[PDB]
């Protein structure tokens, strides 16, 4: 298959800043990926942010910013209030070289 791993629960900041690393592993060695943050609203889905970047290059997005080092993306999200206590899913898409790959994280949980 394809593997995406993200922390089970994170504790957000006193200013609304939550961060953690999302990790992917695959059969290939891809050079262009799209990392997408989603929020699970009980049974629906929201695109929090997304960025198509290439390896080495800037992870350019917004209320999100990012840096990748290998297959780890240090995802930073600023401005989350106590009302955002919900599930944040890490979606990773490997664009090039072919083939495309989809991996979806088991979930990460933020508390504010």
């Amino acid at each position: 298959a394809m593997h995406v791993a993200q922390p089970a629960v994170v504790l957000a900041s006193s200013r609304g800043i939550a961060s953690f690393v999302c990790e992917y592993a695959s059969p290939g060695k891809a050079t262009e990926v799209r990392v997408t943050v989603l929020r699970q609203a009980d049974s629906q889905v929201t695109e929090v942010c997304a960025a198509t970047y290439m390896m080495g290059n800037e992870l350019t997005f917004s209320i999100c910013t990012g840096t990748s080092s290998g297959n780890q993306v240090n995802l930073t999200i600023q401005g989350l209030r106590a009302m955002d206590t919900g599930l944040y899913i890490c979606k990773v898409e490997l664009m090039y070289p072919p083939p495309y790959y989809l991996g979806i994280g088991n979930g990460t949980q933020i508390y504010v």
Partner: antibody
């Protein structure tokens, strides 16, 4: 409601071209990658092509590699399939389909018939 | 390409019975990478279930999926009249997106 509406289907002579278009409405078309999937008469569903929300990433089924190009216009909420060098086996109902944010094709137009024949 | 193969071609059941349809991958597909679609004659197909436990909007809970790796199944716990149709599986974890060749659920009489 999400609604997808294909146009431009009809009869084509082998080796000639045809451009289908899909008119999207009811969602932020700008926000979704889109696909074409086709169905030859009597047979199953065959994926044809993929286009990312911004048009930077495309993928094609090998049976249409080189002959089809996908495109979209976001100002018009329209997805396009440009089919060149058509052959009898490209005869099918062509569906336009939205790639759901979680993996599958969650919304399908009702399809347009493309008949390649002399 | 990940080739998907379905079984049986036609499943013959009476309303109220339970239907188990099969989908087989040529490679190991992740349980959360499969989708099922329903199609009725002359209509576009629509999405039923996908992922490991997820279900598309308005699909009822008699529709449910399982299986790991190579052998997947769609269970229709109690067949309603509106459920006699053709069903297609599809994997969406890697490209190309590939479909099974369909299983018809026909009324046995």
């Amino acid at each position: 409601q999400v609604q997808l509406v294909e146009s431009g289907g009809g009869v084509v002579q082998p080796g000639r071209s045809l451009r289908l278009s899909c008119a999207a409405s009811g969602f932020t078309f700008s926000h979704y990658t889109m696909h074409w999937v086709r169905q030859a008469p009597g047979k199953g569903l065959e994926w044809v092509t993929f286009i990312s929300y911004d048009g930077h990433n495309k993928y094609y089924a090998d049976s249409v590699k080189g002959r089809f190009t996908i495109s979209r216009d976001n100002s018009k909420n329209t997805l396009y399939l440009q089919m060149n060098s058509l052959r009898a086996e490209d005869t099918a109902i062509y569906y336009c389909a939205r790639h759901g944010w979680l993996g599958p094709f969650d919304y399908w137009g009702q399809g347009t018939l493309v008949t390649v024949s002399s | 390409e990940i080739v998907l193969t379905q079984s049986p071609g036609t499943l013959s059941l009476s309303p109220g019975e339970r239907a188990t349809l099969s989908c087989r991958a040529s490679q190991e597909v992740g349980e959360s990478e499969l989708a099922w679609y329903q199609q009725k004659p002359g209509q576009a197909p629509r999405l039923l279930i996908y992922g490991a436990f997820s279900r598309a909007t308005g699909i009822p809970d008699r529709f449910s999926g399982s299986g790991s790796g190579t052998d997947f199944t769609l269970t229709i716990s109690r067949l309603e009249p509106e459920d006699f149709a053709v069903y297609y599986c599809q994997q969406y974890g890697s490209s190309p997106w590939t479909f099974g060749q369909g299983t018809k659920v026909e009324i046995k009489r």
